[PDB]
């Protein structure tokens, strides 16, 4: 048959940080074709396989993973119908035979998973989002756009890692994207006028030497306004606190990043602080506000702020349905960051999204620090009507490629497309 | 017939700086498809059309250009055979009817030009580089990789704009890429150890606050050596002086005080050549772009007389991908290389004519990125299609740059044993 | 796949002189078809394989070469994609395993090389020139048309071998061809009026019993004018001195062909003479003005005349990139005669052309003395925008077939076609 | 439908003498393709159309004929099934509406006729000879190969125009070709050893300054023997006397002084027959073309009465590929063979009718080249298609001639064990 996979081929390529990753190409007998590139990527998440050959790319080569694709996975999957995504994904999971995908490499597996899906869409002559999600695909995601960085991502005295804008008030994704771009550019103008640095970090945002968190937040609010948008109507704020990076015993220790005199907060006090911020600023989402293991803290945070703020588990959940299931049961968080490569197959990715939806949690499809020209996550967000996406700032094609794909998908959907904005926060 | 173009469609999208650009999609009756994305783009080069609507994207929208594609060019080109690239390019040129492509927009035109070629390669089921260049495509380009920035792209006291590494000594493109990546990463470590900034500029390189040019150069040499490579054997240096940015027209001088502070040198054309020669004798420099001002024709000739035998001398602003300027340079013995910017001329046909004119004069043609890039990697295919031998498409971070390097890896892989990375032998001009 | 070569078949056929050559037919699985005929053809050039069976065709049969195609090359190449020209060419080079292609025969190899390319063009349904050169093919070559012959090609007291006209001033190839035809016919009228012979030699030109070189040259100038063209504007002259045929010690000895009292010139004096001719007559190109081994002579000639006369290496370079590379380095010549069968593959042919272009040398694609009905060289000249061609006089279909193909290619290119005339001499 | 002609296109090209001719290209809806090139071409034969523009090609341009194809015939034939050769030929004949094809041009007509047939063979995916002649095609023709020329084609004192060798004794066409080639080459050596000219005429043969007919004939016999062949067993001779060129209408004599000098014979018709008989008795001559004048009907009959049993007697100018002339010749017992010139009649249909009329009378039909030829080899396919058994297509040099021999090699090769080269048995007229 014409839909039968005839070839599966991987090669080593580079990511947005100049570190190796891999891509896989799948062909069907009919000549349908898919390419799947893998982004960069706990003891309970999928492991990427790196070579450890320090004569090449500082040990970060992916040739072993590539060899696993070409010499092990290829022979197992050639012969399947390209459309049998779940069976293929499951076959790979069983072939690796380890929970963490560490034998074959989560990178090897995911590359194939994606390439197969793209080859199947190509075979059926339909867009990837339709192939993945069926006919009722229509929701363009509300983007959370990383504009300013702190913590491990800065030398400024700021504990939180990501500061985002969310153009919830736009009528369309196309407009939402323009809002973000204009705010980003306004911000850059502001930074220069203050003699602050406008070179960018890994996700296309700035890490300027602000005096502190409030400075950073207020500067963002200033850019929103200068661009002609209304904070708390057109545009909200989001944080990735990545609170695990300053958690140590039983305390969130801000001195790690905010200098000798910074606060050292108990879990009760951390919740207090996040609440202060939320009350002071138009913050609609907080990722990793509590530590990856502070389960009681997560529940309390969620008790106090979960009704009117999105609380996203990133390191708390590591795209792991066992972790998400427990969070759902315990009343911890109300949203999950979905990293395809943290789990390693499209099937498991979609299972996570669906588990989250069924619990009333939002599923926020996410980029990684090391990205590629692939835009599959855009198609995933629309395929599942997830309603939100986290794929970077407004510079760097590693980020902009995803926004561009969303523009295409919106364009292609025509009058059927829906950008729900605030209404995508069904968790609130 | 199945090769006939049935639709031509443009939309506004964003570039790597978050500024609008456009893309075009071409379809044939058979269902072959091509997408052409256009990068960001004086008085004798192609002009991109911007909306000037200060209510959107700070006046940088491309909806007028998109409308020109959809409402004027589409009409004109639908019905051509997708393979008639030259006829289509020429048709667009005549339809605009102005030298600079300013009625339709060079952006509108180039987007169609690229999308058509990509749709044709898709129709024929061959790689773009084969479509564009025929069967004898084999040369992987030696990349000049922008690692450190100065001048208008830094707040460090450094006049020159781009400092590049050229991994000429690698056996393959795949190796050459690794050499660059490893040097880039070693440099980043060095910068951190010195408390210098490692965030990146438009092209994915660093703009650290070095004490001066020699500091910057010596830091690159240190990174090369820390990565285990030998400067002047494995890796050479390249500059983009962008000397037009510090040339005083009126006093006919290269005034370094513009970027290097109050006490910096103010050089006559003779002294500028002297200085470039000093650098070339002190450091393993194999290429200098815009070493003299865009209008300093006598200076270009003198520079070329003094250094042209041993150093590549690339006209960027000197030539602006303009064959009338290139023809004059060839005739006067000015420069020995040209930076080829597809969107500075506006069609693939004219791009390839420029490359061929350069080759025939013994000049190298260095296919180049723009500051505002996209996920498109067509320039990779152009470099290989013409066996040009060199490419200039950024540092070793940012997918706007890396996408091109990744495509070069694919092309190399696809060519197998036929691929040739010529390294230093690509400098046929020297 | 449909593009896969399924058959490669050679047979012995005849050339324009009635001597054996060969042709090869290539078929793809889809039924695409190409036929490659080989023209007739130093210790450092490709060797054609002849049978040496003096019971057939005076030892000039090509059945061994044909057997090499059918029984060795066929089995090696069947299975390749027809479009993999370089790999196929390289495969053949390795299969022969000798520098000079003397095991299989350069004739066997080239026949396959050409037939494959023609089958690939046929497969893709595009013209050969497009297949070979990609999309940017447009330059119709300025032809150098051999009108009068001397030296080894005549019994007249004339040392130089070929005298050519170059209709540089025509607006189009179609016009250029007419200029040449009309001049040729005018010349024939002139020859008859003088009781001179108008039967033709191997390339379709005349070898009349002129009194000397000046007589021959002036007779040509007379024909140019009688046809209504202006020498030195519409039409220039070209020589093939083939100076190797009268070089012996350290002198160009004209007595070999021009009788007992002819000049015996040192290399300095030969340069002097060529300069005299160049100053006296509208000569734009001189092939083999110095001997194949007179390297210092070639450099001096090139120093003295290279700025405003094309200096073509034929025996100097024998389509050998090692020889061309050295000439480029030494400042010897500024043009190369490209004989496909002197090197033996299309790939190496195109590499030579590209090496020449990059040095600022013109590449003049050439016929051989023994030609066939094949017109591939026409397509090669346009494919590479080489700008010039050398393919004979204005009689004999072995020559006219190439001119006819150029008319077709010009016709097919429509308004894109460019005949650059003098501007094709980018070396000057 | 897929077999429908969708385009018919002509262009001006050149013949083997460097004079304009034309070609036509035919396409069907399926993409099947044929190209028909036309060779160079009294009052009862088809007339080629020439422009008469003395500013181009000495008045020999074919642009009017090309325009007739493109602007008149194309219109009329587009829409026919490509396989309807007769209907198309007849349609062209009616569209011209003159006996001689002088309105459209026989050249315009024949180019379309050939191109259509070639496009049809391409459509059906069969060889042209099979398309034209059906399944029972097998006879490779015995070639009459013009080696030496006299009369109007020489300045030697020789009245007869063509002297030919016929390799009748070879087992195959491939061998027959070799025999000719080797004899041709041995002759060239002989000519050089005697200081005679070896440059060639229009048909690739020699026109040396021999002392007379017997010298020329004996030199050919010497070449045959030097090549190791036996005259009158392996190889016979043929003449084209072209006797019309030396026939004095008014004194009703064959006047040899026209070419053989002041003292040459002046023969009555009875004496001409006597002379031809002398030659035939002295030399291994198997065929004589135009032995009598084009209008010497009684002379043709008498010649045929005297020599027709043992010698082939070919009407060229006597018949001008005209079935009214052939019919009269058959009826009066004049000649026993006809030279078939496709362009002297102008369509493939009429060509094949002539061949068939000849066969049915016991006359051989010898398919012939013209002085101005092209790279086309259709006449080879015609010879085999009709099992005609003989061909006249030149000497053993010049691709205008050799292309036909090469095609015959291909056809022979393609037929395999079915091919038959009948040699002397092709002379069914004797
Ligand atoms: Mg996080
Ligand atoms: Mg520059
Ligand atoms: Mg020569
Ligand atoms: Mg005759």
UniProtKB/Swiss-Prot annotation, chains B, D:
**Catalytic activity, as annotated:** (2R)-2-phosphoglycerate = phosphoenolpyruvate + H2O
Sequence positions that bind Mg(2+)? 240, 289, 316
Write out the pathway annotation from the protein's UniProt entry.
Carbohydrate degradation; glycolysis; pyruvate from D-glyceraldehyde 3-phosphate: step 4/5
Q: How is it modified after translation?
A: Phosphorylated on Thr residue(s). This phosphorylation is not StkP-dependent.
InterPro entries the UniProt entry points to: Enolase, Enolase-like_C_sf, Enolase-like_N, Enolase_C, Enolase_CS, Enolase_N
Q: What is its main location?
A: cytoplasm
What is written in the cofactor note of this entry?
A: Binds a second Mg(2+) ion via substrate during catalysis.
**What positions does UniProt annotate as the active site of this protein?**
203 (proton donor), 341 (proton acceptor)
Q: Where on this chain does (2R)-2-phosphoglycerate bind?
A: 161, 341, 370-371, 392
Q: Does the keyword Signal feature in the UniProt annotation? A: no
Question: Which Gene Ontology cellular-component terms appear in the entry?
Answer: cell surface; extracellular region; peptidoglycan-based cell wall; phosphopyruvate hydratase complex
Q: Is Signal among the key words of this record?
A: no
- MF terms in GO: magnesium ion binding; phosphopyruvate hydratase activity
Instruction: List localization entries.
Output: Cytoplasm; Secreted; Cell surface
Q: Tell me the Gene Ontology biological-process terms attached to this UniProt entry.
A: glycolytic process
Enzyme Commission number(s)? 4.2.1.11
The UniProt entry, under Gene3D superfamilies, shows: Enolase-like C-terminal domain, Enolase-like, N-terminal domain
Alphabetically sorted, this entry's keywords are: Cytoplasm, Glycolysis, Lyase, Magnesium, Metal-binding, Secreted, Virulence
Highest taxon of source: Bacteria
- Family the UniProt entry places it in: Belongs to the enolase family.
Described function: Catalyzes the reversible conversion of 2-phosphoglycerate (2-PG) into phosphoenolpyruvate (PEP). It is essential for the degradation of carbohydrates via glycolysis.
Which PANTHER family does the record match to this protein?
A: ENOLASE
NCBIfam families reported in the protein's UniProt record: eno (TIGR01060)
State what protein this is by name: Enolase
**Which gene holds the coding sequence for this protein?**
eno
């Amino acid at each position: 048959h014409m839909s039968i996979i005839t070839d599966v081929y991987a090669r080593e390529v580079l990511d947005s940080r100049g570190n190796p990753t891999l891509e896989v190409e799948v062909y069907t007998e009919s000549g349908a074709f898919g390419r799947g590139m893998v982004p960069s990527g706990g003891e309970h998440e999928a492991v990427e396989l790196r070579d450890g050959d320090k004569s090449r790319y500082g040990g970060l080569g992916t040739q072993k993973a590539v060899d696993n694709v070409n010499n092990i996975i290829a022979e197992a999957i050639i012969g399947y119908d390209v459309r049998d995504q779940q069976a293929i994904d499951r076959a790979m999971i069983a072939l690796d035979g380890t929970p963490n995908k560490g034998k074959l490499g989560a990178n090897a597996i995911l590359g194939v998973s994606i390439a197969v899906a793209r080859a199947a869409a190509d075979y059926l002559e339909i867009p990837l989002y339709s192939y993945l999600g069926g006919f009722n695909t229509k929701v363009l995601p509300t983007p959370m756009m990383n504009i300013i960085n702190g913590g491990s991502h800065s030398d400024a005295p700021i504990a939180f890692q990501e500061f985002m804008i969310l153009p919830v008030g736009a009528p369309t994704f196309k407009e939402a994207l323009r809002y973000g771009a204009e705010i980003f550019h306004a911000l850059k103008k502001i930074l220069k006028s203050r003699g602050l640095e406008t070179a960018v970090g890994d996700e296309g945002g700035f890490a300027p030497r602000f005096e502190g968190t409030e400075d950073g937040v207020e500067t963002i609010l200033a850019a929103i306004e200068a661009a002609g948008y209304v904070p708390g109507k057109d545009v909200f704020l989001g944080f990735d606190c990545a609170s695990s990076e300053f958690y140590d015993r039983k305390v969130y220790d801000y001195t790690k990043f905010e200098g000798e005199g910074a606060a050292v907060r108990t879990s009760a006090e951390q919740i207090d602080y996040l609440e202060e911020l939320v009350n002071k600023y138009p913050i609609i989402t907080i990722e990793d506000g509590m530590d990856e293991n502070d389960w009681d803290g997560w529940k309390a945070l969620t008790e106090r702020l979960g009704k009117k703020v999105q609380l996203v588990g990133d390191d708390f959940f590591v795209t792991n349905t066992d972790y998400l299931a427990r969070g759902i049961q315990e009343g911890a968080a109300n949203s999950i960051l979905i990293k395809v490569n943290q789990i390693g197959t499209l099937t498991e990715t979609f299972e996570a999204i669906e588990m989250a939806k069924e619990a009333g949690y939002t599923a926020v499809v996410s980029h990684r620090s090391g990205e590629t020209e692939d835009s599959t996550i855009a198609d995933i967000a629309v395929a599942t009507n997830a309603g939100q996406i986290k794929t970077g700032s407004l510079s760097r094609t590693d980020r902009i490629a995803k926004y561009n794909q969303l523009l295409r998908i919106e364009d292609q959907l025509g009058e059927v497309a829906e950008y729900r904005g605030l209404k995508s926060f069904y968790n609130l």
